[PDB]
Amino acid sequence: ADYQTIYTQIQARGPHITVSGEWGDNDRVGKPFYSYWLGKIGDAQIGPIYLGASGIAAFAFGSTAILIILFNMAAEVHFDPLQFFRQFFWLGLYPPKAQYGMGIPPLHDGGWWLMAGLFMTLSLGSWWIRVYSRARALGLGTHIAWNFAAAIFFVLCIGCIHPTLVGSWSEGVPFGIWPHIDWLTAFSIRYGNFYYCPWHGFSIGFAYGCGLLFAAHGATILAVARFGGDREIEQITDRGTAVERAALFWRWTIGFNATIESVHRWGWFFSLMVMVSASVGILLTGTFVDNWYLWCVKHGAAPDYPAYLPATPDPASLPGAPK
Amino acid sequence: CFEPPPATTTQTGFRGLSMGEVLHPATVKAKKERDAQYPPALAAVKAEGPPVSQVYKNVKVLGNLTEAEFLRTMTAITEWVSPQEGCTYCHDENNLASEAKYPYVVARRMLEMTRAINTNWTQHVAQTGVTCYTCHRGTPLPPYVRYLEPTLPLNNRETPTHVERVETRSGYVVRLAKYTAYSALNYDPFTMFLANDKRQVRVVPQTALPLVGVSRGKERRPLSDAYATFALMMSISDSLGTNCTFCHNAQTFESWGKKSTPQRAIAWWGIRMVRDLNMNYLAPLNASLPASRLGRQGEAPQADCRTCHQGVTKPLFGASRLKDYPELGPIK
Amino acid sequence: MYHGALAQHLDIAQLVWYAQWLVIWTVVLLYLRREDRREGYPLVEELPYPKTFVLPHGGTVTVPRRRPETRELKLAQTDGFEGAPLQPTGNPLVDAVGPASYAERAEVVDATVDGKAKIVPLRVATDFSIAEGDVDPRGLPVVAADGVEAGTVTDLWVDRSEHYFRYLELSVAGSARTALIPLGFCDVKKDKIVVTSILSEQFANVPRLQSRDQITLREEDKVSAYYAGGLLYATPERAESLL
Amino acid sequence: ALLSFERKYRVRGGTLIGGDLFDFWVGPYFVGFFGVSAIFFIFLGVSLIGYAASQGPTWDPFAISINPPDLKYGLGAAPLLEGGFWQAITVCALGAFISWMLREVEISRKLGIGWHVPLAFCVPIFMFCVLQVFRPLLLGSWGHAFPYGILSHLDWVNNFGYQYLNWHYNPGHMSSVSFLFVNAMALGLHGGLILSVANPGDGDKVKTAEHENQYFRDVVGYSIGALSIHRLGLFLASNIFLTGAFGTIASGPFWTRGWPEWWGWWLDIPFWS
Ligand code: BCB
Ligand code: BCB
Ligand code: BCB
Ligand SMILES: C/C=C1\c2cc3[nH]c4c(c3C)C(=O)[C@H](C(=O)OC)c4c3nc(cc4[nH]c(cc(n2)[C@@H]1C)c(C(C)=O)c4C)[C@@H](C)[C@@H]3CCC(=O)OC/C=C(\C)CCC[C@H](C)CCC[C@H](C)CCCC(C)C
């Protein structure tokens, strides 16, 4: 039983390695350090981080958004610090409650929300430029940034795209712990049970698959760690017994297998698709589908159960019943 | 943090839909002993005699009752409303025909209200009906009432903290939260839905696709409406000490027929009946009540689902005094 | 009139549903599953145009590999069945078959980013050290499956690219040679090193390295495989069923 | 029938029980005893689903549902038609799952690799037992288990949830959901990094392990390392269920109220109340 896959027994300590980017080598900041405990279940080196214009930008607009959200939250408890620590999970900054169409809503009723949302978009837009540029600098592919952009796209979908397409800012997600969680039920109910939106189904099936694939993949690498399976880059360019035993494990189990390069394509795809499926489902909701349950009832998909308790007429249809 | 097993579960849906009540037996009991306190029906009396419209001086409601039946009604009323204070709470000790004290005039309107509930609302209250006790439980001010803003504690026989008090702005969110089963839902569902009939609870479309002319822009109902309806349901659920599957199949909250239960239709009359009591009987009592009973906006205390149900799907577990006290309803 | 309804009994959401299913199965069957066939294809006993990797330290490599020599495999047929297992002819550990098999990797040393040897001992790695608090194995005895002292640790071999220990070098007692072992096969203790994968006698037959202070990709496999082959081939009991 | 490098590994042994009698291949698949006990439990599992589906009103795969019994049946045998089938299917499913798990142990021994995948496959099996066996055992009836339908099982999850008003406030759920999100986030990163190092674009050279590290050091100021991420990914995936199971099994046997109210313990502490 390999104890190395549980934890690093003996730790190495060497001089710090610095891969030179095509620009911004001057923009690395900080003297690195080492945590003995972290180096037991990971790499011991902490730092240094890279600065850059796109990094600072994300920290500037991200802080501005956060400061706005926190200020309106503090406001909600009439600026009582003890009642801030206490009620924090329940506190939020809300989209307009009143309908103003697409017109810029009052600062008291969604203005600060829309402005906190703009700076979050600028922050998100900035960090992506950092995830992208840092890859080009080190001569790498932009695979990470395109997966990141898909996730940003989903945020923009539920944040500002859907409110725009249906024509009401009131539809967007509140800022807050419970509050943004409360939107999920508001949104589902309004559009007739998200369990009957096919793209939710796809999104879940990919998220569920992401659990499978990473559990499976991670366990596979750990299973072949004794042959240096963890050195994946050189296992792709020069097939080692590690990924042979790995490929054969699956080919004897499930009947088909991947290569060590392609399983990272299976996982990259399945991740991306979570967000793509999610994005499409939102885009279709409100614009083209109003009640996903009745949309399923139309195309004959929704299951039917008999009555346990007796069939109950809608009393608003009975003769002489109030409005 | 937690509650020890076993649990008490029922079934309200087709096997394997996970529909039904989840109850903690010890809590169900803690309620049962509290609802058992209900005073037993006073022994029936001599039917023969002259009506109290002739016998007495100032009887505007119970005039068709004989004196013997009339004083039995008064005693019963005294048990349910002010048993610590006795007859003197509404009455001038020297003059029982005088309207000096406000609980008198309020009680006559209460008498009219109680008779309305049993007569015009059997769609909800059925053959069980209500008495003065259903709400009051032995105190002039009923334990669970509602003002035009959320107040704490929900049981006004308990002392609130400074934070729980309505003057303290910093407890507003918590005041709001405890009325909606501890949610963060930023809506007062009482003043929105039960204080009057101005708003519509239903928010889900009954068509698969978006209907042209109400699906875009200012023609739309804001998403807030969905949040608020949800708020009401958390409140309704906590009020009766139950859950969603007691009245809905979550598959589709909007659909009736097999997807709803008979309890949902009964609940539907509940909303109509609560609205009727608030607008026509309870809110107009502000002019007859002293300010110490009124809210900050000059309103009188009004009722919700909790007022009668107090954590139980049937108020006092379906205990009735309908036959024993027929003068309180129904009225032919 | 509705938003999104089309001709007949068809709506937009219905169309995108199909387009979704097609997109997925397109990529699954025509892309992702073809990328799976870049190793071990074509089959023996729907192909992608070969992929060329431009290596970090000079040269290029096209997959899958075809070796100018096929290695003879000392395995005998058990049955005449198509998918019948194979029983070893000779000594399966030194022959290197089954769990003892090694891949035909390049006889080159794994390289660090700047061009130095990646897997080296601590006698060369003079700016590398064992972290304070951890057990320095150098000098502790190495005890095998039978409970017999097979050798003494002499050095550690560090991966300079990741700063991670990958091998233990031990002298095999009475056999005037050293052997490498993966740390995966080493239960590191304060007083000894426990190795259950192979018996005490088998250590002498661990694959030897061409050079003392460096190790090729193929060598790294030969060594690693050897011990894993032991997990099935140490005693005659380790092959049969457990119950 | 074989990969260009497969022949050498196709050796006898590694079996837990059976010896030579079950140790063989049928195509790419490995058999063994647990493959036999799998195909049996699968065959008996799928043959009964179809027999119950014929007696059902529909054959539309989205609408079909084989439901467990009513709550009155408790832990006893139900009428085959009125919940009995469901009980027979469960035994088959569990019989096939465990068989499938142990079969992977046989393949791991032969390949001389760790038993990590079959050990990681247990965690799903455990969550299946949580929903179908352990919770219905704690609540008194098999009627609390989810139905076997494509769309109907969603309807069970829906109702189950709303039985506690707002399941999002369930702290076991929050834990579970966060892992789902972070593990799908993690996978995209690990897949994206490896691909970026091997496929830099145009005529650019393949990069190294130092490049991997420098990227995550630059972007987030920390790098976990090549092996570590595969350990983290198993941990992050395994904790979708391992923590979730606690939020599932408390709902009912250990907690009856709404899940938001549970956060009263925090909100109702006297000195800030
Ligand atoms: C408490 C949590 C529950 C839940 C909540 C849930 C939700 C909210 C949603 C699903 C969805 C799905 N679930 Mg479900 N689920 C499923 C399977 C399914 C699929 C029908 C579907 C796709 C998920 C996916 O791709 O995963 C990842 C696995 C992958 C990608 C590998 C491929 C698996 C393959 C697609 C599964 C096909 C199963 C078939 C019915 C075949 C059954 C075998 C036959 C031959 C007898 C199984 C087999 C089980 C078991 C055995 O426990 C299960 C348990 C549960 N689900 C729990 C009860 N599930 C999604 C759906 O849209 O359903 C209609 C969905 O939105
Ligand atoms: C009543 C409640 C329902 C509901 C309501 C719901 C809604 C309204 C929506 C979903 C959606 C989804 N639901 Mg779902 N749901 C899901 C799972 C899912 C996801 C697969 C999917 C996408 C969510 C996501 O991944 O975002 C997580 C990832 C995000 C949010 C991206 C973050 C990345 C970002 C770029 C980084 C930003 C972070 C910054 C650092 C922060 C800085 C900001 C500062 C300024 C404050 C499961 C597994 C179940 C089960 C088991 O029942 C379920 C049931 C329900 N959902 C109930 C039916 N669900 C989404 C969907 O797919 O719709 C079609 C969706 O829109
Ligand atoms: C009203 C609905 C609510 C709800 C109700 C709910 C309930 C009741 C339960 C969950 C649970 C969970 N919810 Mg959910 N939920 C989730 C996500 C999740 C999961 C993280 C978590 C665990 C899922 C599970 O146990 O799978 C189970 C899947 C299993 C066990 C897979 C079976 C594997 C099997 C052995 C293999 C299958 C073999 C096939 C037959 C083979 C196929 C062969 C083919 C290929 C030929 C998200 C992300 C959201 C969002 C975004 O809103 C959400 C909202 C909601 N949940 C709503 C608020 N949720 C679970 C939880 O942990 O609660 C705390 C849970 O019990
Ligand atoms: C972190 C934990 C994650 C995780 C991890 C891992 N997952 C693994 C491994 C690891 C490590 C592998 O070793 C193994 C494998 O080899 O894969 C390549 C496996 C597997 N995971 C599968 C499905 C899967 N993983 C899910 C979830 C997670 N996995 C979570 C996220 C989900 C969800 C959530 O829906 C599904 C559907 C199968 C493909 C496979 C076994 C099938 C089987 O044993 O074959 C044999 C069985 C059959 C072929 C059919 C059986 C028929 C029965 C008798 C009758 C059917 C009744 C049934 C109950 C009907 C209900 C359906 C209804 C609800 C609609």
Ligand SMILES: CC(C)=CCC/C(C)=C/CC/C(C)=C/CC/C(C)=C/CC/C(C)=C/CC/C(C)=C/CC/C(C)=C/CC1=C(C)C(=O)c2ccccc2C1=O
């Ligand atoms: C014909 C007959 C009856 C024969 C008898 C023999 C017998 C017992 C046969 C079994 C019969 C059965 C039940 C067969 C069905 C097999 C099953 C369960 C198939 C399900 C397959 C599915 C849908 C899996 C979903 C997971 C998924 C996304 C897989 C695609 C990606 C792949 C191939 C992942 C596997 C994989 C992973 C996870 C790696 O980490 C890895 C690392 C390095 C190299 C290769 C790999 C690799 O191939």
Ligand code: HEC
């Ligand atoms: C407030 C809740 C009351 C309590 C407690 C008691 N009484 Fe009462 N009294 C009340 C009302 C609303 C009325 C008029 C009813 C109507 O139909 O209009 C009365 C009237 C009487 C009378 C008749 C006096 C007269 O009009 O001449 C009597 C004799 C009387 N009440 C007796 C009585 C006794 C003995 C009580 C204590 C047990 C008692 N009442 C309680 C309001 C309330």
Ligand code: HEC
């Ligand atoms: C019975 C006592 C109920 C319980 C428990 C819950 N709800 Fe309900 N719901 C009930 C009624 C009588 C009505 C109709 C009100 C009217 O005046 O028309 C509703 C309505 C809803 C709706 C709106 C459906 C629509 O037609 O648009 C939703 C979305 C809803 N209810 C959800 C819901 C939830 C989430 C509950 C749990 C907290 C819940 N309801 C409890 C009766 C009852």
Ligand code: HEC
């Ligand atoms: C007091 C005047 C009441 C108020 C205010 C509300 N309800 Fe009620 N309800 C009342 C009685 C006396 C009964 C018993 C009738 C019976 O069937 O025995 C009920 C009953 C219900 C039920 C049905 C309970 C069951 O079938 O087990 C429901 C679902 C119900 N009530 C809901 C409900 C709601 C949602 C209310 C607020 C809008 C509400 N009730 C108010 C008396 C009173």
Ligand code: HEC
């Ligand atoms: C529930 C609804 C009921 C029922 C069935 C009865 N009453 Fe009342 N009552 C109710 C409310 C919401 C209020 C307003 C708050 C308040 O003023 O206490 C009242 C008030 C009274 C009072 C005045 C008490 C006081 O403030 O001094 C009296 C005297 C009274 N009610 C009497 C009464 C009688 C005699 C009833 C039966 C016929 C009766 N109530 C029924 C709510 C409800």
Ligand SMILES: [Fe+2]
């Ligand atoms: Fe990997």
